[PDB]
Subunit: 252 residues, 6 copies
Amino acid sequence: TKTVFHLGVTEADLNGATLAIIPGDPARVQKIAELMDNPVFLASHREYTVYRAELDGQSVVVCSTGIGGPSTSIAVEELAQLGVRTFLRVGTTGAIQPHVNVGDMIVTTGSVRLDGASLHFAPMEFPAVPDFDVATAMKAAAQESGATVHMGVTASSDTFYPGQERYDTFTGRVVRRFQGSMKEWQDMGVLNFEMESATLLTMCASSGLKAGCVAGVIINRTQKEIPDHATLKETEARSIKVVVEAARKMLK
Amino acid sequence: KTVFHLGVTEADLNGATLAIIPGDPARVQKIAELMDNPVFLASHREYTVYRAELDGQSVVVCSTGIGGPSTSIAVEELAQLGVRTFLRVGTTGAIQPHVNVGDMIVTTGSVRLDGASLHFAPMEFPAVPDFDVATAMKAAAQESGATVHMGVTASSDTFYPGQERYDTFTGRVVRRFQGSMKEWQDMGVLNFEMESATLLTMCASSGLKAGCVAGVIINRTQKEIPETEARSIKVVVEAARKMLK
Amino acid sequence: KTVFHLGVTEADLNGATLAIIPGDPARVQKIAELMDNPVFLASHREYTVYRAELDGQSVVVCSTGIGGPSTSIAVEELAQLGVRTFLRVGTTGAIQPHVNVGDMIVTTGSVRLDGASLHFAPMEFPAVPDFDVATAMKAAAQESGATVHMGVTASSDTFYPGQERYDTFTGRVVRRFQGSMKEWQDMGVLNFEMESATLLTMCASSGLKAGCVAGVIINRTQKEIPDHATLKETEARSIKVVVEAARKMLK
Amino acid sequence: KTVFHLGVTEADLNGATLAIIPGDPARVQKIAELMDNPVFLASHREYTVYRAELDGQSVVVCSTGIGGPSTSIAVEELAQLGVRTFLRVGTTGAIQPHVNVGDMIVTTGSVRLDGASLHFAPMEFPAVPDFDVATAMKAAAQESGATVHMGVTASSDTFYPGQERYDTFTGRVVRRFQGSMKEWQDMGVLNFEMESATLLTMCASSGLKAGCVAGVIINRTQKEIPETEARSIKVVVEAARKMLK
Amino acid sequence: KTVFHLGVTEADLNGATLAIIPGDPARVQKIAELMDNPVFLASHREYTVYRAELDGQSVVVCSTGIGGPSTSIAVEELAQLGVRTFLRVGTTGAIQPHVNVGDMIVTTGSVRLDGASLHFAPMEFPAVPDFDVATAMKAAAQESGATVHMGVTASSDTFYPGQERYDTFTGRVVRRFQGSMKEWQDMGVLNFEMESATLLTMCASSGLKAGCVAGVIINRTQKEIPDHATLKETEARSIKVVVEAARKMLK
Amino acid sequence: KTVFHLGVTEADLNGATLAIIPGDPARVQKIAELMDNPVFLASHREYTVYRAELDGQSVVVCSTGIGGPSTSIAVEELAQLGVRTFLRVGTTGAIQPHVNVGDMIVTTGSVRLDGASLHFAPMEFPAVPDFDVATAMKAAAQESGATVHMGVTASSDTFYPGQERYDTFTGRVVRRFQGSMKEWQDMGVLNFEMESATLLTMCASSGLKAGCVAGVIINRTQKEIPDHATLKETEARSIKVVVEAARKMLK
Ligand SMILES: Cc1cn([C@H]2C[C@H](O)[C@@H](CO)O2)c(=O)[nH]c1=O
Ligand SMILES: Cc1cn([C@H]2C[C@H](O)[C@@H](CO)O2)c(=O)[nH]c1=O
Ligand SMILES: Cc1cn([C@H]2C[C@H](O)[C@@H](CO)O2)c(=O)[nH]c1=O
Ligand SMILES: Cc1cn([C@H]2C[C@H](O)[C@@H](CO)O2)c(=O)[nH]c1=O
Ligand SMILES: Cc1cn([C@H]2C[C@H](O)[C@@H](CO)O2)c(=O)[nH]c1=O
Ligand SMILES: Cc1cn([C@H]2C[C@H](O)[C@@H](CO)O2)c(=O)[nH]c1=O
Ligand SMILES: [Cl-]
Ligand SMILES: [Cl-]
Ligand SMILES: [Cl-]
Ligand SMILES: [Cl-]
Ligand SMILES: [Cl-]
Ligand SMILES: [Cl-]
Ligand SMILES: [Cl-]
Ligand SMILES: [Cl-]
Ligand SMILES: [Mg+2]
Ligand SMILES: [Mg+2]
Ligand SMILES: [Mg+2]
Ligand SMILES: [Mg+2]
Ligand SMILES: [Mg+2]
Ligand SMILES: [Mg+2]
Ligand SMILES: [Mg+2]
Ligand code: NA
Ligand code: NA
Ligand code: NA
């Protein structure tokens, strides 16, 4: 009966939803919801915009997370309090491998925990791993969209800048831990950087929740060509089509 | 002349070198309107950005979202655009029985229960505010008539297990955080929030001046889950006034 | 042309690029004989090596011994000899009440309670299998009629304190591991073994494809002493499964 | 009721709740004589203890020896005897080019390159001074006419490799500390000393007020191997005066 | 009365309280036959176990396999069966230019580059031998005419990256271990092997006496390919030495 | 040069390459006077420095103060002046019931509960004595007639919480140290002091020879007060022992 503190929704508001799609950007919430039936705005507070919709007759929540594990952890927790058990993350990513192209899609098979919030759920030795059904559904949905799909490891960083070894910054400095790190992850086969998967996957895998992450590649750190506008727009649309279809696969 | 997330240019800031950085995008306009000629600049994601004038000087107000990661983006991008001083305001849960709802806390150092701070400095580095900003915040807070506590803040990457909340879906907390609230209480830590460790470490190690003031809206010795906010933002604007040179 | 420990050459492998890597040297022949033309290659230390053919393709079977360190040597040396895909089968103790003796587990990620994984990637790197291998193992395991669990495996450098066993010489468990079985249980961890963290981390960070499948021999919430016929049936099914998983991985 | 190391009783302190804690036992009498009625109490090991009176109030002066471990014993045992406020004075090497020999530094937070701080709080906890003490030290240092810097201090369990000195027997520095001076410099750290991390962490986590002020006697951008000390103790006594009320 | 892996019972050990624990199963019989009435007890996995008699006292010889994890099992199960003293002999690669191939090393402490030691004691605990065992080993080593070095051994969960070997499948060494051989050299570390940290930490924290002696088979500052006659001489001497160290311990 | 803290020159040491390093400045003269021609060299801060002659050879006696940090300065500066061997003597609290006040402990390895050791070697590195110094100290200690224990010492940067003392101002002990005394006791640790981890790690990683010997004057497990005579005898015996250990180290 309670209204969760941050998301401002009740369990009844979710109309029985046990699955949530959790993009990063609040603006993307409506966009995902309208790919389903009967999208209804529930609430917007802070970075959390929440809609409900229906997919093959089943209630689905779409809720933005904001950037980063901390804000993601709140949304996932409060949704879980309200009965959500499956969380499908969709979000943009920078690829770091030359073979991954802008417009491709990555389904994370495990995340490098370059975050802090994951540690609030499990010690570092615990794997930031998706639920296998979710990863499988995301792969299938991504392939069916016509996308080129990569399964692999994602580096999930609490920062956009030094943790992704960006030097074009105010200080131009990167702390010792992250100096040379992009090359190290590249050499280790890591596909991409984003900022939420380690927290999400660790939290869920250690809490009896099913989670997975799919991402559209919007830049490649190894390509000094500017991503074409059309490809990006197409990638935006494809990513959310894919996550909704992955949700469909998870429901039945 | 652009930044990746904030959607504003250096020109948009009209020479501002100080930012007030609340967490909640909805607080941005409220803070801006406490100043002169507030102007909406941009809103994208958790980042709503206004400018206003305070004693004739441009000040930026920019929300951070919850947590170190989104905060770190805002601070970096504001710094790219010339901002050098960052005044954090927000709400907080006190963990000391003598710190009351409505009191204000000015953080003298943060327990780094975050990940992003480590992306700027190793854990041994202190998450401490710039002394002038802390001084200005204490003065603004005290001058307002508030009851003000200076001290250590536990700054957590989570709202729930890292602040040892149990009224949660799993109802459990990982080993590291079991008993942690009592430990911080024993150690004299005043309060929990989610951004100061990142902000203070990032800034103290990057030649930026930062500080945090917080309004206490719950006492965790009383209960787990929750006018103070209005008073806090008046205080931070006065702190900004004191920082203006 | 030579490796330091395995005592086999690239030529001995006859072009094999896939290895099945059980823990027990005695299991190697058993696995090899599920395939065509099994040939004993070498046995040195804990490394017994056979080759066989699966649908006309050479497959190597090589034991790892117990633990990440000896596993890491075998994987490295096999990789030097051209092996790129590693299918681990091994016995395991389940820790979840709902995971029954005789069930099978395919590891989706390992809790890195080992040291050797850190020699390949820092702790934040996930000990996760190659998705194709995990998919092949799940399919093989399910097709066999087994009850199959996908999930997290706690992978320990010890059998005793790191798996929170107290019935030991000292009866002591270091602080780090006191209460750890309950913690992993609460976190949904399915089982304990002693090699997957090393194997999965090493491979995932080295451009090698790896996965682990295991037959549940005991459940820690029940008894430590397995029933002989049950164990035998589980072990036989597990090696049939890993061979079919290899079949699925063949190109 | 005589503490294990310091060789004094609570009665010996005549109600003092403030201590000045230099490192060198020889400085103890020198600080004490800046106050009224200095009396020698005890000398054992590196711990020389005097009492004196400052504006009518009893103050203890107690040396710490070099390093967190010996400092921790002195602070603990003084605290057992009623001391609640600890003012550290000492010498320091600056690592910033703009900080000059003769300048003073008031530590706003310490990089915890020590071990004893961890015996009081985990590394995440900030080695930060009490704000009142830091404020009093700044004011006292300024009023002496000293050039004063507020900022972060790297506090090392060694004088040599932990301060990245190479003119040593081995001439080498362990991986952790190779390039560390430059890293701290880049992060805006002002100086190196050896006690503040322990002192500040211990006190901040134990309900004790502490701060550190230091006279710069060498600039490490200039050389490795090293009036400043006279003025420094004047300043710390004046900071003590400000703390009393 | 039984154990989980070694396949021997307390009765099988005939009251032995001392074990010689080589790494290689094939070395077990070679050690046992230097004593009286050697008898094969069991061979399961990497664990080959013999008993013999030394000056009228039963001694067990039990291989460990490679690595701390398999070693920890052997030590634990032997301790369950009454063994209290563990003498490790094994081959090693020296990293100091002044330590020659054919020299012997008695470990005075190990750099804990392993994971299993942490399952017995946190990292700050010293991986230290029992002083009587180290003393006996030094004496035995010296009496054999060997050139003997007492000092620190780096004990790695891997043979390859943890010993900073680059001539590998990936040719990569994780950041932690890049430059590590030079660091250990500069710190006076004598040699690398893969079990002593686990063994010494486990034993020193569990009321068991342990020590490690090793013959230098290669020097990393020289060549990786040992000369056969030199290697054979060194290995023969090492097992003679460890049996004499056992004699000294049992006196 | 005159070293910065110790205030002595190389010439002042008259060729000494061995130092006895007690903690307490007041103990320096007492040790020096057990030898021939004791000469006061300097006193600054916690560093009182004497020279004396032992069998015609110059020996330095230099106090360290309490704790690794001040110890590290003294060892470094003496090493700059040619000192290569460092014999630590002091008193200690035992934590094992079988260790009696008046017994002596020679440290075979230290639990690194300090910070300064990390400034010389990472935590994995063992805080272990030079074998010759430990051997000499054991011999000197046993020849004195004392009961001598060889074993692990817990070396703490604090006297209070790091030794799990609760009779303190806050009565609080941080999580890391709660239950730690029982843990070290169960791991066979003999005693607590506050310098050995730093000293041993520093020296063992820097090509310096060091060891520690200590007289037991308190036992944390015994609720009886040791009498004056015993304590006096123990203090005197400890320094007689360290000087005899120095004699044994002279070349
Ligand atoms: C392009 C890119 C996006 N992201 C994530 C961060 C934000 O959440 C979002 C937009 O930048 O996508 C990265 O983390 N790294 C990248 O290189
Ligand atoms: C009331 C309260 C707020 N906060 C902070 C974190 C977020 O920035 C914001 C909303 O929860 O306030 C806490 O961290 N803990 C609390 O108990
Ligand atoms: C039954 C069982 C096996 N194992 C693994 C370890 C060895 O690799 C092998 C033999 O015990 O199986 C465990 O790790 N835990 C268990 O509970
Ligand atoms: C000059 C100087 C002093 N100190 C401090 C530590 C001791 O407390 C004291 C003696 O060196 O002064 C440093 O740590 N570094 C320095 O460079
Ligand atoms: C020669 C050599 C052996 N060893 C150990 C590992 C194995 O246990 C055994 C065989 O290689 O000896 C090393 O660890 N490093 C070496 O350089
Ligand atoms: C009695 C005792 C002494 N010590 C050491 C610390 C000092 O160096 C010296 C005096 O207390 O002896 C301990 O560390 N613990 C003890 O229990
Ligand atoms: Cl998004
Ligand atoms: Cl806010
Ligand atoms: Cl409340
Ligand atoms: Cl097996
Ligand atoms: Cl001083
Ligand atoms: Cl200078
Ligand atoms: Cl061997
Ligand atoms: Cl002493
Ligand atoms: Mg660098
Ligand atoms: Mg618990
Ligand atoms: Mg059941
Ligand atoms: Mg069942
Ligand atoms: Mg030579
Ligand atoms: Mg030679
Ligand atoms: Mg506790
Ligand atoms: Na956010
Ligand atoms: Na001292
Ligand atoms: Na093995």
